[PDB]
Design a protein around this ligand. Structure first.
Ligand SMILES: CC(=O)Nc1nc(F)c(CN2CC[C@H](OCc3noc(C)n3)C[C@@H]2C)s1
Ligand SMILES: CC(=O)Nc1nc(F)c(CN2CC[C@H](OCc3noc(C)n3)C[C@@H]2C)s1
Lengths: 450, 451
């Protein structure tokens, strides 16, 4: 029983580089995962200019990339997205699509995908005269490509209605999916993101629902750890909301993770744990394993001689804290959720300190300040660690939380000194606001803060 | 007369990748520049763990990188920074340094550099017993490496006192530089950043000053476009503050630019213009050329057939505006300087609208709101162009300017409404503050903005 488990590079944003992808293939193999779907939205020749051939430089890179996948026994799948401006009814458009995939096939690629995600449902007049519907047009060209490429063992199709919320009028009664299930050649796989684009949970019943109308078990394109929809978000939490009971009901799972390559250790490690779990998986136990394994990636003179360069090393606790601060799309981690609650409470109840309630406030304030210090401890230790590669992939996120938290600790301390002081708390007096660089900082200082 | 002109990848931050460096070599050649100094502070084996050999994977990458430099006729210079924890007096430390540079030499590298920048001046007791000073220790090992590597044609030394402000007690009377000038082998080049780490201007007289004590013309390591000292600063302005009169008084210029690769088009293009200027250079003319050339990097069906994908293209004006907002360390660009002045004025004179003065306020407010709209327009055209990745390098900056700017436009609109509406202006009510994502955003919303 073949099962596609791995990664889809299918986000908007800076595509990953050779060095990173080769590293991804090493990791997938060691974690017994087997698939890689090549689909960067911002490779201008994958989507926007799907018609254009790859240059000689681009060709050498793709050959190298495909050889690296083969070397680590990872199935490389080349995806193409022609849906933005293709005229399905034009024979010249069909041979251009064939020309493009023959080029990539000449680079050693054996598996392919046709994606029709995030495109206008409205066809041109020429296509309307040839196909009963949009689904007819897509299936027609997808079947033609699949057969033209000699019916590859691994060939995927991504529908325009790729999740529950995108199905018109719904999953069970979609005429688009109806056509897909009936006319799409049986050997072609169908990609699905679950109930939503970013699914909190993928319930077994929803997979049975879609499998009936598409007439096959789908391959999940999972957006649980994707973050290209918010420049200020990062998901270091475990694979969650997908029962192992989905495994016999699926043809595979391809995770579409965070843009920042090094942040995808937990995302991919926990998915591998889930896949090999023997129908018994715990997100908390999986997160602990991933964090423990991740920590490894973070790592002589005389008395009158110069001491060797040394830094206070990153701890498991620092990583537990970090993952809890940058957790999942629908939940913060325990430690982050707790800190937020503590801050909300202290701010809401600051009036008691402006008897047992005063004791409660001071006790919770002291515990919060320690929590704040631990975030600073984490920042400092990460910023002085051996692995600069891991650090600079997340630095902005960590720096940002560290900065906001020091203003929060200051404010909580100010609220405490209120009984002994009439001094005012000003955001303008805080270093992140006052010492903010660039032209933007000059403008920001002139805004009416306080 | 050999003259080293090019780039030094010598900052703190994420090092550039293979794809980027190969592109840098293509650009340097086409712009008739010739040198690349490899010195990323955060390549863990360049500085922090200078002793450790490169792995097999690291080795293949360095070989590929060095072959790419040769392919585009760029001199590749490998730098090593052992100064944080080296015991100069230890023979084992000296052979480790030799072992490390023999490894990189085996990858095809012919040129080398020893850097002693940003290190504690205080030597260990073992070193004090062997060398009269810190300068003695450095020169000793630098001369040993240079000769051990068979005296390479291109060999550089970066002093601990690499700029005017870092010289104790001053440039002309530095005992450290005195030792450097006297004992450093003549064939070795000395790197210098001018009067400061980030020099506003490099005056000819300052180069004469330093050349006397170091007893040679230096190679400028220029930090004009560097941005690792501030997470919120970016420099797209032209090469400025360095007369072409410096060229015959220097062994070269190596620019240390912004951490974000695609943001170094102007920085490197204008330096090439300056280098080939034939003693007549204009920063404004150079900036215009660079911007015009950079615009190129941003770029049939029937009537009943589907129209080809098309995007509203990025304009020269958008680039002029972008460069003006992220200009130079000591100056904003005209358009950015103007916008700031307009905002300062409007805020300072808001009381008139709380007769000809009211007309002035309303007129300047309207012009400012258009200026604000042009910034959003620029942001939008850049995020929807053919080459999205250029903006992916600069996103944090463009997003931040766009965001503050929208809040500033709101504030200016609120100020002009104070005569009619009684509504209060709240930062918390503004979209960049209110719709801020992540856990950090949740905490930020709970901060006492507006008291
Ligand atoms: C088949 C399939 O899943 N195709 C995809 N293509 C890309 F580029 C994806 C990544 N990003 C793109 C931006 C999307 O922002 C809109 C959004 N939808 O909900 C939320 C939350 N944001 C989120 C989405 C997760 S997922
Ligand atoms: C010989 C020579 O010039 N060597 C250099 N090494 C690095 F890494 C440079 C780049 N950066 C390093 C950081 C410097 O920040 C100092 C600073 N000032 O306030 C704060 C905060 N940091 C500025 C300087 C421009 S220049």
């Amino acid at each position: 029983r073949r099962f596609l488990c791995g990664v889809v590079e299918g986000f908007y944003g800076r595509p990953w580089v050779m060095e990173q992808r080769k590293e991804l293939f090493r990791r997938l193999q060691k974690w017994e995962l087997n698939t890689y779907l090549y689909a960067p939205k911002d490779d201008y020749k994958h989507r926007m200019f799907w018609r254009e051939m790859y240059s000689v430089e681009e060709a050498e890179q793709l050959m190298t990339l495909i050889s690296a996948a083969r070397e680590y026994e990872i199935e490389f799948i080349y995806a193409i997205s022609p849906g933005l401006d293709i005229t399905f009814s034009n024979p010249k458009e069909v041979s251009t699509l064939k020309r493009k995939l023959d080029q990539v096939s000449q680079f050693g690629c054996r598996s392919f995908a046709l994606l029709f995600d995030d495109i206008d449902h409205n066809m041109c007049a020429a296509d309307k005269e040839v196909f009963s519907s949009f689904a007819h047009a897509q299936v027609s060209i997808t079947n033609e490509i699949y057969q033209y490429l000699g019916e590859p063992e691994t060939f995927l199709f991504c529908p325009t209605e790729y999740c529950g919320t995108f199905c018109y009028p719904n999953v069970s009664q979609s005429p688009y999916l109806r056509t897909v299930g009936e006319k799409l050649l049986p050997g072609i796989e169908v990609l699905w993101t679950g109930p939503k684009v970013v699914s909190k949970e993928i319930p077994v019943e929803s997979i049975e629902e879609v499998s009936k109308i598409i007439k096959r078990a789908p391959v999940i394109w999972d957006n649980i750890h994707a973050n290209d929809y918010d420049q200020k978000r990062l998901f270091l939490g475990p694979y969650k909301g997908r029962s192992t009971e989905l495994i016999p009901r699926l043809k595979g799972v391809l995770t579409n993770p965070n843009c920042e390559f090094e942040a995808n250790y937990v995302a991919i490690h926990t998915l591998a744990t889930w896949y090999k779990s023997n129908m018994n998986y715990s997100p908390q136990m999986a997160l602990k394993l991933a964090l423990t394994e991740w920590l490894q990636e973070f790592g002589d003179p005389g008395p009158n001689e110069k001491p060797l360069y040394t830094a206070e090393p990153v701890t498991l606790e620092d990583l537990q804290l970090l993952a809890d601060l940058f957790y999942l799309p629908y939940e913060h981690g325990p430690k982050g959720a707790q800190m937020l609650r503590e801050f909300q409470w202290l701010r809401a109840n600051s009036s008691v300190v402006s008897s047992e309630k005063i004791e409660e406030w001071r006790s919770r304030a002291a515990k919060f300040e320690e929590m704040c210090g631990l975030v600073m401890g984490m920042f400092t230790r990460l910023s002085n660690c051996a692995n600069r590669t891991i650090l600079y992939d997340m630095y902005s996120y960590v720096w940002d939380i560290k900065s906001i938290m020091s203003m929060v600790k200051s404010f909580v301390q100010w609220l405490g000194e209120r009984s002994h002081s009439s001094a005012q708390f000003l955001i303008g007096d805080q270093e992140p606001w006052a010492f903010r660089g660039g032209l933007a900082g000059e403008f920001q200082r002139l805004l009416p803060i306080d």
